Symmetry: C3
Subunit: 445 residues, 3 copies
Amino acid sequence: SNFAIILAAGKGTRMKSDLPKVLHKVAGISMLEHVFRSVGAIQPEKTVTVVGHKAELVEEVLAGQTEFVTQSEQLGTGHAVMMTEPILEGLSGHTLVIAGDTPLITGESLKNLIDFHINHKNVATILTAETDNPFGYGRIVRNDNAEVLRIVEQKDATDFEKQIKEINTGTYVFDNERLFEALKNIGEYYITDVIGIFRETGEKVGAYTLKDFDESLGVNDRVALATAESVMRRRINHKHMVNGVSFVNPEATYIDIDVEIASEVQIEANVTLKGQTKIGAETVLTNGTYVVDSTIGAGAVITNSMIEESSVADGVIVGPYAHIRPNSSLGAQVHIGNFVEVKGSSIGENTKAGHLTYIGNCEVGSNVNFGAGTITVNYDGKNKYKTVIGNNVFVGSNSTIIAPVELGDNSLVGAGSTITKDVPADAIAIGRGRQINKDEYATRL
Amino acid sequence: SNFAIILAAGKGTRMKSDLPKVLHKVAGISMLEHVFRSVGAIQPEKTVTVVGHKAELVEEVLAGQTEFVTQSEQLGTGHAVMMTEPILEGLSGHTLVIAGDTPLITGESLKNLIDFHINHKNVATILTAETDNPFGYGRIVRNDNAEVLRIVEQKDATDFEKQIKEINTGTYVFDNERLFEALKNIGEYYITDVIGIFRETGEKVGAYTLKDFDESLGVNDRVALATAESVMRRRINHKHMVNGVSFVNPEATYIDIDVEIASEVQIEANVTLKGQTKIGAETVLTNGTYVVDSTIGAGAVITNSMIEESSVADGVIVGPYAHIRPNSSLGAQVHIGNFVEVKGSSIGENTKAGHLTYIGNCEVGSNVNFGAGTITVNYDGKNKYKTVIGNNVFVGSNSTIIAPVELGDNSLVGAGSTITKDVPADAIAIGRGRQINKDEYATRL
Amino acid sequence: SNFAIILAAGKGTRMKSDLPKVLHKVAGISMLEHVFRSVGAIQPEKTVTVVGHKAELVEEVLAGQTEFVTQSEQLGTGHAVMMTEPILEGLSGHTLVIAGDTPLITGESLKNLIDFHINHKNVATILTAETDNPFGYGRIVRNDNAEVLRIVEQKDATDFEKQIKEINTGTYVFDNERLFEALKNIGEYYITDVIGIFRETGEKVGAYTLKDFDESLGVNDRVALATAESVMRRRINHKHMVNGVSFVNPEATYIDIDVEIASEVQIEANVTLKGQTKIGAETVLTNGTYVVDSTIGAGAVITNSMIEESSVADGVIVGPYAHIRPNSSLGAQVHIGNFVEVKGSSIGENTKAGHLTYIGNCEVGSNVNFGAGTITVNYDGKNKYKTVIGNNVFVGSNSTIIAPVELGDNSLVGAGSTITKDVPADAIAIGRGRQINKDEYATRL
């Protein structure tokens, strides 16, 4: 039986933020979420998460996927662990104590932490790591037989102890029953003082050493937040590359934790993919493309464009400098060119809009052609209207389509026309001015 | 006499691609091409390239610059080298065996490989390298006199041999005659088994050690492809910096292998230069500028813009957010502003188009001024027409020029005009509507 | 008493530039300026800067903040220091000799250099550093008692001396009086030969060792210029992160030396902030945003946009792909959308311009709405006019406003209208064409 307690009560003053430290994001989700995900690797029978500062905000994040307990005042990690008492004391198993500000720790590492605690029948196993610059961290003191004696911080550290490279990551696995009993024995309570109690009784204490020290990073400020962003960024992009995705520069490409990318997808440097984004097979993404919560089919080419909460079928060609705003759909083989904005509209297959065009709140059929400079109007300073555009409609360049209006199938709008009324199918609509040339007049200008 | 065999038959399954592994690109050209380029450094009397998977595709790449031989089924490097038999066996010299998936290997290194093979009168010289993590590679076993005894992989590797840091790069130089005779002696044939034959006869075998281990990289997946991209990117940008080109961030600037850049050229981070692109002296390129197969004169400023298959004279100012599409020319001192697209058109010197304008299929003279919002129409849903614009023509803002039409020299198009007929020189053309004010009417809106 | 001499006479041939080497920029200001800034940390009673090549250009940079002396021909560092004679010889103190091509050297390091020179009563203290690749640099020879004997370059370096890791950074602190007297004793004069004179007299010579070797970088070419850019970039971004600014990628974000950023400001990768730029609290900046000499209030969101010499109040939402040109102001909560350009205009609070719009030379009130495709005209091929737009004016989509004109409060411009005359308050202005439908006509197209 395995149990788990997630520490997430500290405020994080070095962050210079009012947001709970653990809620700061890394590659899409909060640090707390990354921690919770690694936890499930040991399939915890019960999971308790200690909260404190702005408990409301935090509870919204992991609501329903773990139990909670509130900590009034910051009375240390010991008091924090004591809040888990009403729910855990009286259960046989291994209770892992992990902080929520260590996003890089992986599930496999926690499995390894649990397997070690069992294999060595320890009463308390400490996840440690080695570094050639141990300044600040508590050091793991052992003996000639490699047995873990005690953790000593830089307040009780003698010169001989000040050289120990093996440090404490602040992540442990304790024997449930013994843990809460030893907490009653111990100006703040430290979870580390629990090891002192076990020592007096000569109870078995071990230490699992993390292979990658950097995986133990504890985020206390934004400098470390960026480092977490760095490790996580590399991790994610590595996986994608193994999955058959080419990266011009995986070190400078920004893909969120939950983004899905098919094989053969080619991604240039400086591409941003955020939220619930999916990329179909063979799709090409160029430098500057920014996608938020969108689905992109296969064989599509997104050249330096921004796509938010929209769907993009296969064969779609977009950009450069195009903007696909929320609630839009681009049918197969649709072409959206430079300086074109599509907002809250559905675009049928093969429709072309290659230049300086605004399509807002429109239902557009297939094989439609938007001439450069076409503007659709839906707002009047109060109300929002809709326009229906049929299949095979040719919309003249520099035209203005004023909603509500419907352009029937195979309709044609003359260039420079201002359309206020419906255009029946197969009809042509013109509404501009006639050209008048005046000789020798450009001489007076 | 020096000979050369280029191995390029493997499929590369870890790539998760149907494209031949060696054809994957790095900084503009295929890995195979980078390899071929290093080869010519030893001026090979004859060059044979072993192919296999999709031989057609590969042959198009190096057609006419090297001989070829096809390998039916993947029967190992030994069989691959045996395909070179009909063309090489019976020649006196040094035959270099290099794989096409090692893009970073330089010509100077191969020269050094050939010079070592000669200076030491070896029958087989192995290009090796040292690493502190030799897991996977075959290890070079020597003796107390430093003589190369044999290569041992991780299948015959004893614990004492499992610690050797000197590994085999998979690149060799063999004595031509002996090579093909020893191949007849040896479930797949390995080019490494050839060294076993030489050992039995006590024939001289040496090893040239690469100074930079990373130069030996063998691309088997996209992770390594990106690493090659990384090394090659740095290499190219280093050269440019030595040639007098400033880089804000050479680690995050993407310049293809054959791009030419003059001195004093200033390049901000995140600039992309692809294909046959040339940059004149003192030209400034800002973050986001993307250039494909284009020539740019001196003293030009390209601010966050995209230029494809076009020519840009000196003093040209472009951007930000401008798009110069295929088959365009921008005369000297031409100014193209934000959200302006130029497609298949010639633009005379000093012509200005600073805002939200589309110029497609036009021949434009010098000193022309395109008012913001000017649209040129050439397409009607079937045909593409052309428009001629003379010198000193002032094109009114928000005007629509409908091809085929000609605006004579010093002509003027009134703002908001829709032009369908030619405008004679020195004439003015207007074709809009008159303004009508209605008092107290905006009260009912 | 502390004195200072700044060496800035070399041309820098490996730069392949006509600009004085020291004037090349790093994170906004010249290398020379970074040097001068570190100098003031020791509060120099008198500061002399040695110049030579294009002395005019250099003097403009540090004019009034330091004294100058010109060097006719390049006769070495010794001659350069001798130019300081007329102003310094005859003063009691410590004269620091620093070159202007070492931008990374910090003020704290120079303070430490001065404090060491005093604490050890040296006649000449040498700022040295250790590296495992000392090729090229002069090596600090000491003895069994750690006393500094002499500096030996790679021309007099014996094999035993060729292994010394401690090198000379080219930065020193000499006893003023002795310095200029020893210069008269010594085909070019070297400041290093001064140590030889002190040795003959057995005068005390020490060496302060820089903790960070990379801080000693001397820029001789653009490769090193980029490295300086790299260190300086990291330094600046580190400070900001400590000040509470989040960075997705501090390694790929470009912020000039004097930029000011408030806490809680969120900055995505690839953001550029240049010159005298200020960022208010909580403001969000996305990938591609480029800001030059501008002020941005709090809570603003700048999505992939370019803002030059302008002011942006709080709550302003900009982008993507927007261009705020010189001399503009955006009142609170102003919204500027994609492909919109604002030039030399003031925009009142809550005014919206969300699409393909050009606003040049306009004074615009609050609560104004610019419909997509709105164009303002101010140029006629000679003169520049101005337009006044009141509060609550609704400007129709695809309209053309021709200056000089005034749109009174609560005015309305019909979509597609070409406005040439003032529109009184509460009035509506229309000037387009009527729609005419022709049945079965789109059949012949």
